Amino acid sequence: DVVMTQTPLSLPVSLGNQASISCRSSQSLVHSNGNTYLHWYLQKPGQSPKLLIYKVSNRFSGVPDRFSGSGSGTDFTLKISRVEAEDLGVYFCSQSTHVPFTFGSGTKLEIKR
Amino acid sequence: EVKLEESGGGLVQPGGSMKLSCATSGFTFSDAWMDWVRQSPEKGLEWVAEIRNKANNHATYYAESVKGRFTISRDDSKRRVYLQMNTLRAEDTGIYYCTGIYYHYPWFAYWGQGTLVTVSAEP
Numbered sequence: 524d525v526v527m528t529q530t531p532l533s534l535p536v537s538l539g540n541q542a543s544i545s546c547r548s549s550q551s552l553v554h555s556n557g558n559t560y561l562h563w564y565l566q567k568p569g570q571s572p573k574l575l576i577y578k579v580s581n582r583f584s585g586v587p588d589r590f591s592g593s594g595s596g597t598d599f600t601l602k603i604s605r606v607e608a609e610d611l612g613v614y615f616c617s618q619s620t621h622v623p624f625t626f627g628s629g630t631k632l633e634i635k636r
Numbered sequence: 637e638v639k640l641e642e643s644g645g646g647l648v649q650p651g652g653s654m655k656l657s658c659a660t661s662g663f664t665f666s667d668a669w670m671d672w673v674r675q676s677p678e679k680g681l682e683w684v685a686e687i688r689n690k691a692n693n694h695a696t697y698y699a700e701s702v703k704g705r706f707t708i709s710r711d712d713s714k715r716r717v718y719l720q721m722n723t724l725r726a727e728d729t730g731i732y733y734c735t736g737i738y739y740h741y742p743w744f745a746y747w748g749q750g751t752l753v754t755v756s757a758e759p
């Protein structure tokens with residue numbers, strides 16, 4: 524299976540800061556049809572995952588523009604211009620280019636207490 | 637509005653059996669490929685099984701770790717997906733979520749809130 528890796532495991536930030544999350548794949552996520560099926564989800568405590576960005580940089584319905592995604596091949600990055608409370612939780616990257624679909628271990632975006 | 641809701645979770649002993657259900661609404665069900673994805677601190681999020689649409693004759697696919705013990709099925713008439721888990725193991729413990737994809741949109745766009753499955757013989 525394609526191994527997905529995220530760093531950092533934890534990203535403590537103060538509201539209003541900038542945030543950058545890294546995700547890497549064991550092999551290129553470029554599909555034979557040309558597309559790159561790498562997606563980002565956000566999961567709040569006790570809640571289920573919510574799709575935030577699909578196909579590297581496309582924001583899913585309702586997702587604010589403070590969220591943006593980039594990368595290509597085996598290296599990607601999710602960024603938040605200025606973190607807000609509703610953005611706190613665990614971020615997971617996932618690829619659906621190769622079956623079975625696999626997920627990264629997750630990055631916990633938390634308040635710097 | 638897309639709605640997905642799992643039910644059936646509970647605490648079971650190793651080697652036990654349990655059936656999960658997922659009620660859905662808000663999207664065309666018959667052409668959707670429905671999936672079950674689980675989550676545990678041990679292995680994080682992991683895809684468990686998928687059942688394609690009628691175009692694929694409801695072809696089923698399973699993670700290697702559950703093949704032969706888990707059976708995914710669906711009732712297109714009721715718009716529900718199911719997961720029969722037999723010969724359960726401790727490592728099967730986790731929150732089970734119902735979600736799915738469409739052939740042209742291979743991403744888990746919507747997830748149910750989940751149902752908790754605990755396989756343990758002692759607290």
Ligand SMILES: CN(C)c1cccc2c(S(=O)(=O)NCCCC[C@H](N)C(=O)O)cccc12
Pocket residue numbers: 638662663664668669735736737738741742743744745746
């Ligand atoms: C629950 N699953 C399979 C899904 C439900 C709704 C939308 C999904 C998407 S999407 O990228 O948000 N929709 C694009 C086309 C969907 C049109 C469909 N005939 C409908 O009834 O909404 C992607 C993956 C799974 C979705």
